[PDB]
Each structure stands twice: as structure tokens, then as C-alpha cells.
Design a binder for this molecule. Structure first.
Ligand SMILES: *[C@@H]1O[C@H](CO)[C@@H](O[C@@H]2O[C@H](CO)[C@@H](O)[C@H](O)[C@H]2NC(C)=O)[C@H](O)[C@H]1NC(C)=O
Lengths: 50, 35, 49
């Protein structure tokens, strides 16, 4: 929905209020999104590097 | 993460505790002679 | 056992390191006088020049 980025998507057990769309924790890095079509909370994790 | 990595220390906590125990046992039993 | 804040030195070393990392990360959101703080939008919004 216009919020773009790379990473791996997993299932999440968080619980948004019925009006949020996505979440972030600290330093404003997105960590979870709600898909517009299923309305279930996903989870974002950067894919590995080192 | 954002290109940031944290590396683990070479010595683990158990090894540090083992040095501490060795030093303390030596100073209890021998004195300063083991230095 | 009871009295707290007796280990202020180690605690403040940890706090300083964490604060430095936190501000370094938060600096990524600054505009720096450009038109946006994200590369993808700038690339997708206007021409190379
Ligand atoms: C958007 O479209 C999807 C696809 O049809 C809808 O999801 C369906 O919802 C009904 C319930 O009303 C279920 O019985 C279907 O199994 C669902 N299909 C799929 C593929 O998930 C969805 O309800 C629509 N609306 C919204 C707001 O997402």
C-alpha cells in the first residue's frame, strides 16, 4: 500500500487496534504490516547478511 | 538491524568465572607465592 | 542485596553505548536539505539529473 521495502515476511501474533495499518518500535523502523486484503498482521525481518 | 553487527567476545562468562575461581583458590591456599 | 544503583559505572557505560547507537540509527530519517529521506521515492519521483 505504498510502503515499500525488502525483507522476509512471517506470521505475527500482535494485535492492532482496528484502525492502525502498520507498526514500528524504536528509531522508527517498520516491524509489522496489515495486508489490505486479508487484514491479518504480518511481521517483517531483514534477510540475513554478514 | 541496518548494517549493524555485534560480535561476541572471545572469552565466555564461564571462562572468566574460572579464572576468578583459580585466582581466589590460589590466594587462599598458597598466599602470594603462586605469583 | 537491597541497595540499588551501586554499580553506576557499568550501567552508564552501557547506556552511553546504547544512546550513541540509537542516535546514529535515528539520523537516517533526516532530510539534510533534500526533498525526501528515502532513496526509492527520490529515484521513482524524478529524472536522474
Ligand atoms: C476482499 O476480497 C477478498 C477476496 O474475495 C475477500 O475475502 C473473502 O472474504 C469472504 C468473507 O466475506 C470469505 O468467505 C472468502 O473466503 C474470502 N476470500 C479470500 C480469498 O480470502 C474480502 O472479504 C474482501 N474484503 C476485504 C475488506 O478484504
Amino acid at each position: 500500500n505504498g510502503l515499500t521495502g525488502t525483507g522476509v515476511l512471517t506470521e505475527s501474533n500482535k494485535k492492532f487496534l482496528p484502525f492502525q495499518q502498520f507498526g514500528r518500535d524504536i528509531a522508527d523502523t517498520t516491524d509489522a504490516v496489515r495486508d489490505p486484503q486479508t487484514l491479518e498482521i504480518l511481521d517483517i525481518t531483514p534477510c540475513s547478511f554478514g | 538491524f541496518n548494517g549493524l553487527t555485534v560480535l561476541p567476545p572471545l572469552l565466555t562468562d564461564e571462562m572468566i568465572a574460572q579464572y576468578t575461581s583459580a585466582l581466589l583458590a590460589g590466594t587462599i591456599t598458597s598466599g602470594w607465592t603462586f605469583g | 542485596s537491597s541497595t540499588a544503583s551501586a554499580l553506576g559505572k557499568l550501567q552508564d557505560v552501557v547506556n552511553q553505548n546504547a544512546q550513541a547507537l540509537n542516535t546514529l540509527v535515528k539520523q537516517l530519517s533526516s532530510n539534510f536539505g533534500a526533498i525526501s529521506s528515502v532513496l526509492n521515492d527520490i529515484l521513482s519521483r524524478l529524472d536522474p539529473p
